[PDB]
Amino acid sequence: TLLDPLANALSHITNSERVGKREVYIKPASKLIGEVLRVMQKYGYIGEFEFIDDGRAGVYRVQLLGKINKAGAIKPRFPVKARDYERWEKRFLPAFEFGILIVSTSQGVMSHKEAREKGIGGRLIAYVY
Amino acid sequence: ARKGPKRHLKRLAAPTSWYIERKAYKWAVRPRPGPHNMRTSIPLLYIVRDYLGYAKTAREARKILNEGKFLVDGRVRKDYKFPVGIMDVVSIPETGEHYRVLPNRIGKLILHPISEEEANIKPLRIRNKRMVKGAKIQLNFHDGTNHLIPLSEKDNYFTSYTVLMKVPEREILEVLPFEKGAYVFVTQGKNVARKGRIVEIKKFPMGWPDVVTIEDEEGELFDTLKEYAFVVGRDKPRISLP
């Protein structure tokens, strides 16, 4: 059965970008997926996106630009402290500032660079590069 | 200690508040029971030999002590195992010098030179207070000494207050209350050797110790245990501090 809407969205995106699709539809929407999409758009990985209302949980429509090498979810959502971002970067990313880790903190969802600037930790939920 | 009390002390196991070389020899002086506790005092022999340097070997240090050349709180001490602790006054009258024993910024005991007039007074923290037969009040200070007061003055003394005592006559001449705005000097913990003024007091249930907040000279605030705060004046120190 369905267990993780967020993982399906990122796997769908990375599958679609490899065959040059220009847009995708994320089927079960949620606030968390919206936040992740906002963060991804801020750094220029995706184009514009919009929310479409059906009688069910709603759909997301996303424009792709062919600027993503890989995107995935992190399970389990490990907790991370404010000064331990380096080893996770080595575990998931290819260079010392290549891509972003997405962190859920008590102040919202943000990339690990902003969180390190604010000096706070949280839970890792995804990576994009 | 399988069958009885210990009598020896290795150099490597010596208390961490002393200035001593831990690998030079095997043994160290095991201090005698006395005024302060183990963690806040040092045997007199190390003061005579290692700190001041008046003696090179232990044997000649004992010859100095047996002649009564050293005064601790105005009383002659001949035992080389006698413990010397916080706020004590060490006086050498023949050379006319006086020191006060104080903790360092990192938690070690050092000697602070003081004037002759200041050498006659010792601050004592009221550690406990109880009733005794004949309906009198007994005060127990932080260095283990005791004093008696009549039932009439039972409201002028409470725990954590500081009493200025004239030595060696042991006569009271000043009482400093523990309240907001009092001047304090920290004696243990992470913030040892810092000084300042009291700002706030907090309490907790089920017997956890209470905490105080202190503002220093530059206006920074820091917290510490209430029992680690030693009152030394109303708004300015009454004694010289480094």
Binding site: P76, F78 | P205, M206, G207
Partner: protein, 107 residues
Amino acid sequence: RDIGLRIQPPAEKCDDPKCPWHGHLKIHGRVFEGIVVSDKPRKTVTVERQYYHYLKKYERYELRRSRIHAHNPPCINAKVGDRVLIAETRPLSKTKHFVVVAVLERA
């Protein structure tokens, strides 16, 4: 009456000398909160508390549970299934070293 816990005392009184509210017993040390899982013996309950333990090698958690036997004063008289608050005292039997002081949520 207050015993340092800052909670409400029980409704009625008892004659047990081992009751911290009405007897001579004193409480000092740790204070725990748990769920009663057995009350068969006279004046005795078993309380279970759950927690998580972290396995460093596998960077994951596991669930562990702790069971403590406690004295049950007649003025309180806890039953199976309710949340209770227990405090540490002097030894009372071979296995009893705690006493129930309050019922937080009746079953």
